[PDB]
Amino acid sequence: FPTEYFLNTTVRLLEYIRYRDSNYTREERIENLHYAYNKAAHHFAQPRQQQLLKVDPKRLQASLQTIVGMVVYSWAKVSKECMADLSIHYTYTLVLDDSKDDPYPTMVNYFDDLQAGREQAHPWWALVNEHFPNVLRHFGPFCSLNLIRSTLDFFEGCWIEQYNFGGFPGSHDYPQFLRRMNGLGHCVGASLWPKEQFNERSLFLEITSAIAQMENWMVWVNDLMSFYKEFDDERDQISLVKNYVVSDEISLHEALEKLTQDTLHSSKQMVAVFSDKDPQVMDTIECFMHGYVTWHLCDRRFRLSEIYEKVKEEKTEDAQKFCKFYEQAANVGAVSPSEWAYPPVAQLANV
Amino acid sequence: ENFPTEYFLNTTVRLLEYIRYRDSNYTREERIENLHYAYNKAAHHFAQPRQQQLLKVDPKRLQASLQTIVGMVVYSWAKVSKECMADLSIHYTYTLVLDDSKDDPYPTMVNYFDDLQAGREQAHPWWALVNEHFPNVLRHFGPFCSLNLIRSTLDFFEGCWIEQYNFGGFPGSHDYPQFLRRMNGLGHCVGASLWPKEQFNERSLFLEITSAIAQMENWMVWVNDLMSFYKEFDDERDQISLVKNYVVSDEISLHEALEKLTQDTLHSSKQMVAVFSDKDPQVMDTIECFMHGYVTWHLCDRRFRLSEIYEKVKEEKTEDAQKFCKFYEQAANVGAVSPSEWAYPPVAQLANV
Numbered sequence: 177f178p179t180e181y182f183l184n185t186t187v188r189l190l191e192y193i194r195y196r197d198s199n200y201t202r203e204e205r206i207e208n209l210h211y212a213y214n215k216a217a218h219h220f221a222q223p224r225q226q227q228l229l230k231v232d233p234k235r236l237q238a239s240l241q242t243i244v245g246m247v248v249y250s251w252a253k254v255s256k257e258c259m260a261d262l263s264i265h266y267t268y269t270l271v272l273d274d275s276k277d278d279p280y281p282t283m284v285n286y287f288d289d290l291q292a293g294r295e296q297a298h299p300w301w302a303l304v305n306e307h308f309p310n311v312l313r314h315f316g317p318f319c320s321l322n323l324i325r326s327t328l329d330f331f332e333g334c335w336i337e338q339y340n341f342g343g344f345p346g347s348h349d350y351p352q353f354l355r356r357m358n359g360l361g362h363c364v365g366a367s368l369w370p371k372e373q374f375n376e377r378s379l380f381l382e383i384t385s386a387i388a389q390m391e392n393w394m395v396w397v398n399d400l401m402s403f404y405k406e407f408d409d410e411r412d413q414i415s416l417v418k419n420y421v422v423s424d425e426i427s428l429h430e431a432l433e434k435l436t437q438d439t440l441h442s443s444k445q446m447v448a449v450f451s452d453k454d455p456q457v458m459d460t461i462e463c464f465m466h467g468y469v470t471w472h473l474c475d476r477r478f479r480l481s482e483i484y485e486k487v488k489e490e491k492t493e494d495a496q497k498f499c500k501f502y503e504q505a506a507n508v509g510a511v512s513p514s515e516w517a518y519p520p521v522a523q524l525a526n527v
Numbered sequence: 528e529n530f531p532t533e534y535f536l537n538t539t540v541r542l543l544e545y546i547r548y549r550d551s552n553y554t555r556e557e558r559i560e561n562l563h564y565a566y567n568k569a570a571h572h573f574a575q576p577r578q579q580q581l582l583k584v585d586p587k588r589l590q591a592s593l594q595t596i597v598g599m600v601v602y603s604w605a606k607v608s609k610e611c612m613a614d615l616s617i618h619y620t621y622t623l624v625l626d627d628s629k630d631d632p633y634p635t636m637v638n639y640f641d642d643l644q645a646g647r648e649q650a651h652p653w654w655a656l657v658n659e660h661f662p663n664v665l666r667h668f669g670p671f672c673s674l675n676l677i678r679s680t681l682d683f684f685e686g687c688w689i690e691q692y693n694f695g696g697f698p699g700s701h702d703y704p705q706f707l708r709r710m711n712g713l714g715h716c717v718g719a720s721l722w723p724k725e726q727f728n729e730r731s732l733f734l735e736i737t738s739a740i741a742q743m744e745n746w747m748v749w750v751n752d753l754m755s756f757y758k759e760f761d762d763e764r765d766q767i768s769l770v771k772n773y774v775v776s777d778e779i780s781l782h783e784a785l786e787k788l789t790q791d792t793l794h795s796s797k798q799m800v801a802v803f804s805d806k807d808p809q810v811m812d813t814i815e816c817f818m819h820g821y822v823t824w825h826l827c828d829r830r831f832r833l834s835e836i837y838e839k840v841k842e843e844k845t846e847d848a849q850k851f852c853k854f855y856e857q858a859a860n861v862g863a864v865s866p867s868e869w870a871y872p873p874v875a876q877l878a879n880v
């Protein structure tokens with residue numbers, strides 16, 4: 177693991193994007209964290225959900241928390257209810273993103289069942305489509321469509337990932353094709369615009385553009401920050417960076433530089449395009465980026481903590497410019513789960 | 528200004544060499560046999576009263592679209608059954624027609640999801656017809672492939688939706704162009720429909736198929752953007768194409784964007800070969816037959832007026848010029864077919880019967 181080269185880039189992106197979540201107080205975050213968590217936990221604890229969603233209780237609990245965090249810290253300008261509902265949806269998606277089961281047998285009649293109104297055979301679809309309306313009520317038709325599509329894309333993405341395939345050497349189009357499939361880009365980007373706060377028809381071009389640009393910023397920033405936790409990992413192995421290596425036949429270092437250039441560039445352009453656009457829009461966008469990074473740095477899932485401390489023992493300036501940031505975030509978003517994530521889902525389920 | 532005839536010619540010959548454009552066993556009699564089968568089933572379909580009244584399209588554009596599509600399917604899906612060509616012809620005809628509705632889908636998409644989950648017929652007439660017909664397309668494929676078709680068609684709907692705004696992207700929004708081309712390109716639909724379950728085992732060739740979907744998506748749309756460039760060069764009506772959006776969004780010259788499209792296309796082509804040459808023989812055949820057919824179709828269908836940019840250079844001792852003409856003569860040789868030989872009777876005639 178190029179812990180070395182790891183420092184190098186993360187610092188660039190952070191310094192160039194200039195990570196700094198100012199707006200949004202700790203009391204406010206906690207208030208939201210608990211609202212979302214609470215509604216989601218009660219949801220996932222219902223018997224139906226409990227029996228159709230096959231997940232180890234502890235992974236569910238962990239996933240839920242990582243997601244409530246992500247939504248609350250990035251969808252900073254939406255209502256509490258919207259955060260809660262988005263938290264449920266993104267929790268369903270994450271539970272699948274880490275799973276393993278062939279969907280072939282349950283997808284054989286997908287379309288006929290869909291058109292007929294019969295409950296899907298794949299349990300996941302049964303639960304997600306049943307819950308979906310609670311997510312969709314927060315948006316206009318256009319945005320809704322994007323959510324529906326991206327979630328469908330995501331299902332296929334997980335399907336493909338089950339083959340643990342990084343692409344045929346020479347298949348340069350494979351990597352990004354896959355990252356987009358399992359990235360939920362359009363889902364994320366469109367869910368940033370609740371109809372209660374934005375007029376889908378008045379800001380159509382703004383919203384469309386944001387969906388298109390955010391799709392890449394969002395996934396590439398995650399590929400970058402995750403360049404730690406995913407690796408000697410099992411469900412990983414097939415990451416955008418690792419697929420670049422396999423498919424583009426280049427070194428891990430070269431793929432790394434690539435991701436970085438795309439990321440930095442994507443970042444530069446997000447600003448260039450939205451700075452002068454509608455203020456409300458620029459705020460939702462800026463608040464998302466800062467929150468998204470805050471979440472990456474704060475959530476243990478990405479073990480970003482180490483690469484701060486364990487690089488705190490060595491002055492390489494590239495490992496010190498990194499640390500100037502981490503804390504900068506942990507002091508805003510570092511919150512003990514005992515302050516919001518309670519009681520555990522399992523406890524509500526057996527009640 | 529002035530069509531980059533030379534640069535164009537070069538790229539076109541190169542594109543063809545890379546894909547190994549060469550003669551095949553698909554005979555003219557065979558094509559005609561297929562052309563008529565597909566056209567006939569489709570025309571009878573589109574001529575039914577229900578279809579006739581929910582699909583708002585000028586009879587002549589329907590007729591023209593149907594023909595352009597039957598041609599595209601028959602000439603590119605060369606290895607699939609007649610029935611599959613027919614059914615794909617109906618589906619791709621629905622898709623081509625939707626770019627005729629200026630009608631805002633907003634009011635008809637408000638309850639899209641609740642109606643979908645409940646099993647109630649969609650409010651947008653297009654969806655009502657397409658989803659009703661879809662099964663006839665889906666029976667030809669396994670679950671995985673089916674899903675790709677469903678998704679891409681949904682993406683396509685949104686693509687048309689966005690295109691109604693005639694928006695080429697905010698200057699600086701470098702991600703807009705391709706984001707849009709992919710949305711309205713039907714890539715995954717095309718790429719996945721190339722593998723009928725009757726002829727391919729979706730599970731045995733999963734990686735082959737997935738990879739083809741991913742690579743074909745770009746080859747297919749970029750080749751079309753390229754061949755369609757001449758017809759839309761001076762066309763003041765056409766305004767938001769991949770190339771024109773590159774200009775607006777990337778803030779570069781039409782010539783520079785043209786370069787970008789060419790490099791991606793050529794490169795996409797090189798890699799299609801590099802990856803599939805050594806793979807399963809039947810897979811490489813479906814792929815190769817698609818590329819050659821797709822190009823044949825572009826050159827042969829008048830929709831792209833490629834005929835003109837020939838009658839302008841069929842006499843020049845230039846290398847590219849001559850190769851181009853030889854490839855065109857090859858195309859015509861096997862693809863130039865009078866509509867009176869298959870496209871009959873007209874849809875309108877079956878409708879009023």
Ligand SMILES: CC(C)=CCC[N@H+](C)[C@H]1CC=C(C)CC1
Nearest residue numbers: 619620622623711712713748751
């Ligand atoms: C201009 C036409 C009809 C086809 C060339 C490629 N398209 C961009 C795709 C989308 C629309 C369909 C129906 C098929 C493929």
Ligand SMILES: [Mg+2]
Nearest residue numbers: 273337358359
């Ligand atoms: Mg994934």
Ligand SMILES: [Mg+2]
Nearest residue numbers: 273274411412
């Ligand atoms: Mg993952």
Ligand SMILES: [Mg+2]
Nearest residue numbers: 398399402406
């Ligand atoms: Mg990642």
